[PDB]
Design a protein around this ligand. Structure first.
Ligand SMILES: CCCCCCC/C=C/CCCCCC(=O)OC[C@@H](O)CO
Ligand SMILES: CCCCCCC/C=C\CCCCCC(=O)OC[C@@H](O)CO
Ligand SMILES: CCCCCCC/C=C\CCCCCC(=O)OC[C@@H](O)CO
Ligand SMILES: CCCCCCC/C=C\CCCCCC(=O)OC[C@@H](O)CO
Ligand SMILES: CCCCCCC/C=C\CCCCCC(=O)OC[C@@H](O)CO
Ligand SMILES: CCCCCCC/C=C\CCCCCC(=O)OC[C@H](O)CO
Ligand SMILES: CCCCCCC/C=C\CCCCCC(=O)OC[C@H](O)CO
Ligand SMILES: CCCCCCC/C=C\CCCCCC(=O)OC[C@H](O)CO
Ligand SMILES: CCCCCCC/C=C\CCCCCC(=O)OC[C@H](O)CO
Ligand SMILES: CCCCCCC/C=C\CCCCCC(=O)OC[C@H](O)CO
Ligand SMILES: CCCCCCC/C=C\CCCCCC(=O)OC[C@H](O)CO
Ligand SMILES: CCCCCCC/C=C\CCCCCC(=O)OC[C@H](O)CO
Ligand SMILES: CCCCCCC/C=C\CCCCCC(=O)OC[C@H](O)CO
Ligand SMILES: CCCCCCC/C=C\CCCCCC(=O)OC[C@H](O)CO
Ligand SMILES: CCCCCCC/C=C\CCCCCC(=O)OC[C@H](O)CO
Ligand SMILES: CCCCCCC/C=C\CCCCCC(=O)OC[C@H](O)CO
Ligand SMILES: CCCCCCC/C=C\CCCCCC(=O)OC[C@H](O)CO
Ligand SMILES: CCCCCCC/C=C\CCCCCC(=O)OC[C@H](O)CO
Ligand SMILES: CCCCCCC/C=C\CCCCCC(=O)OC[C@H](O)CO
Ligand SMILES: CCCCCCC/C=C\CCCCCC(=O)OC[C@H](O)CO
Ligand code: NA
Length: 456
């Protein structure tokens, strides 16, 4: 009888848990770059704005990378329900430390807490949604669609509420609101979950066997030791600026899939090779999409007349278009019975739309010059285009592909950590035109390659 939009009642709990976590996350993302600008302007943070942009990008990269690890830790060590709870606690702490009366000195600690916390929570709330359904339950896709609406809803309202709070009451109060958002999520999660969640998920479902503990320990220890060795050598040869560390994280984030690629190609060999263009297309798409909170956020603050509203509000456009497009594409893929495009073709076209979203942004500077301010509608059109691309590439991404798919966004963001340092008023038009055109061209290349990939 009683449901949450046709689904098991437990979905309401997880819906709200993620909505409020996404609220805390995207509330932070909407103001953190501006916060670093503020800390630079007061002389508390001694970096360039370019490096601040780089930080935003690599932050996102590590959050995504962390997400590829959290499922293992839940499934094999601590359980999905405690992963979500303690992940949320860590996330809340990460916002609290920025709410505290510190300055730049608290930034790194905040970032680490949220990287670890999001890694624990994000994959595992998704897992818990699955546990609501039997294997044979046809409602599963509908349920995840509803869950995703909650995600986007949280992403949508957070810049509005947290961004407004920031401009009125300051950054510390704004970060306190992010923390409170996660707290609300934890309250609903903790008390609601006890009502509907299977007790089974209080513990690992595939706990380490006795003989598995030592090898895992050796694996992790060697990884940490090597990473620390690299940092020691870096400091010895004088490569110890913040950009150097960001470069190290960039290399690590990119080396991970590259090593996977090199592994599989060495160790259906055709299939794996054919994924390379798809994986590259996904990386470049996520790169462009993830620049919304960095380069488009910069354009919004410097190049747009937003005198009458908080410029952080532009970050709401991304989840807004997702919500607006979704029922149309839901309809589209079911109504498109005859000659529906293949997944490789969807990637190509998706990459093209992302390219167009940047080519569009080259136009105001080319037409009006870069010294003035332009209509907010340029950014609206840009987000409209890139999200159109997301609708094509994202729903079939994991399908056509596993971890390397989830890694595509991490790698895209790591690429951004390098690229966004190139963006400024002098380079604006060339930046948008170059990377936009480059993306369209590779989209066109992928179209040429499409039939072969579809065959394999
Ligand atoms: C399924 C297709 C519909 C959804 C995607 C279409 C959205 C694309 C919009 C690109 C054009 C918008 C950019 C034009 C613009 O910014 O004009 C500014 C001007 O009006 C200043 O007053
Ligand atoms: C400034 C750097 C901060 C570093 C973060 C400190 C904490 C990092 C990792 C520990 C969190 C793991 C939480 C696991 C836990 O609470 O136990 C779960 C277990 O009891 C349920 O089976
Ligand atoms: C830097 C200072 C940090 C001090 C703040 C520490 C945060 C304190 C509490 C946050 C825990 C929220 C958990 C909400 C909840 O439902 O817990 C109830 C449950 O534990 C009852 O057994
Ligand atoms: C895993 C896929 C990697 C593909 C990355 C594609 C782009 C990579 C590097 C391009 C950087 C060089 C272009 C620099 C540039 O021209 O900036 C434009 C503007 O600043 C002035 O022209
Ligand atoms: C399903 C149809 C949607 C696919 C998108 C179709 C895109 C078609 C053409 C894009 C035109 C790219 C033009 C490149 C350009 O104007 O760059 C010039 C600029 O670099 C001058 O330096
Ligand atoms: C240092 C910050 C404050 C720490 C909060 C401590 C909260 C008190 C006891 C910990 C409760 C552990 C709950 C773990 C858990 O799996 O919760 C899930 C719920 O059962 C619903 O799935
Ligand atoms: C496999 C788990 C993922 C690994 C997480 C490692 C996270 C390490 C660094 C986070 C990247 C953030 C760098 C930005 C940064 O350090 O800013 C600090 C302040 O600017 C201090 O000057
Ligand atoms: C159960 C513990 C967790 C409670 C939820 C997190 C609450 C976080 C902060 C509470 C409100 C803090 C007031 C804002 C603040 O820190 O001062 C604002 C600035 O200091 C003034 O510029
Ligand atoms: C900065 C890296 C942090 C690494 C933390 C993960 C630790 C990795 C390996 C150690 C094993 C973790 C505990 C395993 C454990 O609880 O044993 C229980 C087994 O089920 C007993 O057979
Ligand atoms: C960060 C550097 C990498 C080292 C990770 C720290 C290792 C943390 C814990 C390893 C402790 C050894 C695991 C044995 C264990 O606790 O299992 C207990 C089982 O329940 C057996 O009764
Ligand atoms: C549980 C802690 C694990 C730490 C995660 C890895 C963090 C290590 C390197 C990532 C980049 C951190 C360096 C950021 C930083 O503050 O460097 C500033 C230096 O003073 C350079 O001026
Ligand atoms: C899955 C295996 C992952 C292995 C990661 C490989 C990392 C090996 C070497 C990292 C190279 C060190 C980067 C340091 C760096 O680029 O500093 C340059 C700065 O611009 C100096 O000012
Ligand atoms: C009424 C619009 C539909 C609901 C949007 C909720 C808020 C989402 C984004 C707000 C930030 C970007 C809006 C700026 C904007 O579009 O201004 C357009 C003006 O007509 C140009 O001056
Ligand atoms: C949706 C399918 C149709 C795609 C429409 C988007 C096509 C976009 C542009 C096609 C015309 C290219 C104009 C390029 C242009 O005028 O550049 C200006 C010069 O470079 C000025 O130096
Ligand atoms: C397949 C979906 C693609 C949707 C295409 C619809 C958008 C059509 C044309 C977009 C061209 C954007 C440039 C507009 C422009 O430059 O005019 C300047 C403004 O009018 C300023 O007065
Ligand atoms: C389907 C319609 C989507 C709208 C996107 C169309 C954008 C296509 C071409 C616009 C590229 C504008 C490039 C401007 C440019 O680089 O030339 C200007 C010179 O550099 C002088 O500033
Ligand atoms: C296909 C599913 C339905 C899509 C939802 C509608 C969103 C479609 C396009 C939104 C693009 C808004 C761009 C606004 C813009 O620049 O237009 C120029 C001004 O309207 C001229 O006054
Ligand atoms: C019954 C609904 C009718 C179907 C609407 C489908 C929407 C498809 C494309 C709408 C594109 C909106 C952007 C308009 C635009 O680009 O105008 C550019 C002008 O040059 C700006 O002055
Ligand atoms: C089989 C090897 C895989 C190749 C790795 C893909 C990474 C390709 C390019 C990395 C991006 C480097 C761009 C450098 C750049 O232009 O900006 C650098 C900044 O100015 C300084 O951080
Ligand atoms: C200034 C001249 C540069 C213009 C570039 C011209 C080439 C651009 C597009 C050619 C597209 C021809 C379509 C052929 C094609 O993709 O075949 C489809 C395959 O069967 C699908 O994999
Ligand atoms: Na404003």
């Amino acid at each position: 009888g009683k449901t949450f939009f046709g689904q098991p009642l437990g979905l309401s709990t997880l819906f709200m848990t993620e909505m409020w976590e996404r609220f805390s996350y995207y509330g932070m993302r909407a103001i953190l770059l501006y916060y670093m600008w503020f800390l630079i302007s007061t002389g508390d943070l001694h970096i360039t704005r370019a490096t601040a942009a780089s930080i935003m990008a690599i932050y996102a990269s590590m959050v995504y990378l962390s997400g590829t690890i959290g499922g293992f830790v839940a499934d094999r060590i601590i359980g999905a329900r405690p992963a979500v709870f303690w992940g949320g606690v860590l996330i809340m702490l990460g916002h609290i430390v920025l709410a505290l009366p510190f300055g730049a000195s608290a930034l790194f600690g905040s970032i680490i807490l949220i990287i670890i916390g999001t890694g624990f929570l994000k994959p595992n709330v998704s897992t818990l949604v699955g546990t609501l359904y039997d294997e044979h339950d046809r409602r599963r896709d509908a349920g995840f669609s509803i869950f995703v609406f909650g995600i986007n809803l949280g992403a949508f309202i957070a810049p509005l509420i947290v961004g407004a709070a920031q401009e009125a009451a300051g950054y510390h109060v704004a970060f306190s609101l992010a923390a409170i958002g996660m707290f609300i999520g934890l309250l609903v999660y903790y008390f609601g979950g006890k009502k509907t969640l299977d007790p089974h998920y209080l513990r690992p479902t595939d706990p380490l066997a006795p003989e598995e503990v030592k090898p895992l320990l050796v694996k992790v220890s060697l990884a940490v030791a090597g990473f620390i060795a690299i940092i020691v050598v870096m400091n010895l040869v004088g490569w110890n600026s913040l950009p150097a560390y960001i470069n190290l994280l960039t290399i690590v984030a990119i080396a991970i899939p590259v090593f996977y690629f090199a592994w599989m190609i060495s160790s259906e060999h055709l299939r794996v090779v054919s994924y390379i263009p798809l994986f590259i297309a996904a990386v470049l798409f996520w790169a462009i999409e993830e620049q919304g909170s960095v380069v488009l956020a910069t354009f919004a603050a410097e190049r747009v007349d937003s005198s009458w509203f908080p410029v952080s509000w532009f970050q709401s456009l991304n989840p807004l278009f997702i919500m607006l497009y979704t029922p149309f594409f839901a309809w589209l893929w079911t109504a498109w019975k005859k000659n529906q495009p293949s997944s490789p073709t969807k990637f190509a076209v998706g990459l093209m739309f992302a390219g167009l979203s940047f080519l569009l942004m080259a136009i105001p500077g080319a037409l009006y010059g870069t010294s003035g301010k332009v209509s907010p509608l340029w950014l609206v059109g840009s987000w409209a285009l890139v999200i159109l691309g997301e609708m094509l590439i994202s729903p079939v991404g994991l399908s056509v592909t596993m971890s390397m798919w989830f890694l595509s966004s991490s790698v895209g963001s790591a690429l951004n950590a390098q690229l966004v340092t190139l963006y400024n008023a002098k380079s604006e038009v060339a930046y948008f035109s170059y990377f936009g055109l480059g993306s369209v061209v590779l989209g066109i290349v992928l179209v040429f390659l499409s039939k072969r990939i579809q065959g394999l």
